[PDB]
Amino acid sequence: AQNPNCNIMIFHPTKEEFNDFDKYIAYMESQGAHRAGLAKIIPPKEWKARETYDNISEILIATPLQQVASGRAGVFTQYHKKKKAMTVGEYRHLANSKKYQTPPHQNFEDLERKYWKNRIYNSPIYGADISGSLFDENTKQWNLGHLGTIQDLLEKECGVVIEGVNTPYLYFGMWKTTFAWHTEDMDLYSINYLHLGEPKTWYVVPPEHGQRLERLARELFPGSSRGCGAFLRHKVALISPTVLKENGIPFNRITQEAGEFMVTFPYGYHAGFNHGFNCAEAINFATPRWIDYGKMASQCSCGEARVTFSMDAFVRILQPERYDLWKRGQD
Ligand SMILES: O=C(O)CNC(=O)C(=O)O
Ligand SMILES: [Mg+2]
Ligand code: NI
Ligand SMILES: [Zn+2]
């Protein structure tokens, strides 16, 4: 079996290998990349996402989110308080202000220490989940706005034609902005490209061990767990690496820098934080290997997680028994 210790693998495709996205994902899995839950893909040196980022300041972040924490330093939840709209230019200036800028630090490890020590005491503002793309339309390779759609994948594998569309999202981050422990909707893959700015640190639990993380989470967030049998779908819980180690949860960590892609694999729980002002783009995608995970994916029916239009059809077709109760949650 390849990659039996479930390490995060890093790939350096040639320009030729960068042509066929599906085939390269399947190559990475042939080498065991998926066992980690997360892989890093460094593009060939000939590739670019677009010519420059000099003209992005006028993108609007309609609903910036202030991420307010509650709990203890290593075990906390965050809620998102909606703020007034601002442009990317305004946001970048806010991220660089004394109140929000990255502190002096030695290296990524020192900054990681400072994050876990101090995150809870601040409420950074995240421009998350903004529909759009920063890939040039002329970028033909690994263009996250030109991938094969999940609806088309389901049709190709299972023969059923369904409604729905699949588009990318932009994420504008600042120091301490945080993504909570989650898998993707319907345990899809995701791909994330760090277009610009400061890094993003990732933590991940191998898919084969995801239920270990879930069990810990139910212990650490006991009222959340009573309220909903899939509360990590709410995307509000954080657990530090120290806490994971104390509880014997298998995980790995890696820092993504600008210019790099990360791929999360089905049922690969992940969480992380941004080091400073940055912009990432991400999208969900599927492969044939996903179908079995989509059929088994947990679902939030308490009503909190409230997800896209396009998830309806996935639930309807892959999880018809759940469908009724799940949609009661959506309505
Ligand atoms: O970058 C972020 O804030 C979160 N991204 C993801 O969870 C992802 O790409 O799957
Ligand atoms: Mg602009
Ligand atoms: Ni994700
Ligand atoms: Zn729920």
UniProtKB/Swiss-Prot annotation:
Co-factor binding comment: Binds 1 Fe(2+) ion per subunit.
Annotated Fe cation binding sites: 182, 184, 270
GO annotation, biological process: cellular response to ionizing radiation; chromatin remodeling; double-strand break repair via homologous recombination; inflammatory response; positive regulation of chromatin binding; positive regulation of double-strand break repair via nonhomologous end joining; regulation of gene expression; regulation of protein phosphorylation
Catalytic activity: N(6),N(6),N(6)-trimethyl-L-lysyl(9)-[histone H3] + 2 2-oxoglutarate + 2 O2 = N(6)-methyl-L-lysyl(9)-[histone H3] + 2 formaldehyde + 2 succinate + 2 CO2
Record-listed PolyADP-ribosyl glutamic acid modification sites: 16-17
CC per GO annotation: blood microparticle; chromatin; nucleoplasm; nucleus; pericentric heterochromatin; site of double-strand break
Domain JmjN: from-to ranges: 8-50
Cofactor section: Fe(2+)
Annotated positions binding Zn(2+): 228, 234, 300, 302
Role of this protein: Histone demethylase that specifically demethylates 'Lys-9' of histone H3, thereby playing a central role in histone code. Does not demethylate histone H3 'Lys-4', H3 'Lys-27', H3 'Lys-36' nor H4 'Lys-20'. Demethylates both di- and trimethylated H3 'Lys-9' residue, while it has no activity on monomethylated residues. Demethylation of Lys residue generates formaldehyde and succinate.
Name recorded for this polypeptide: Lysine-specific demethylase 4D
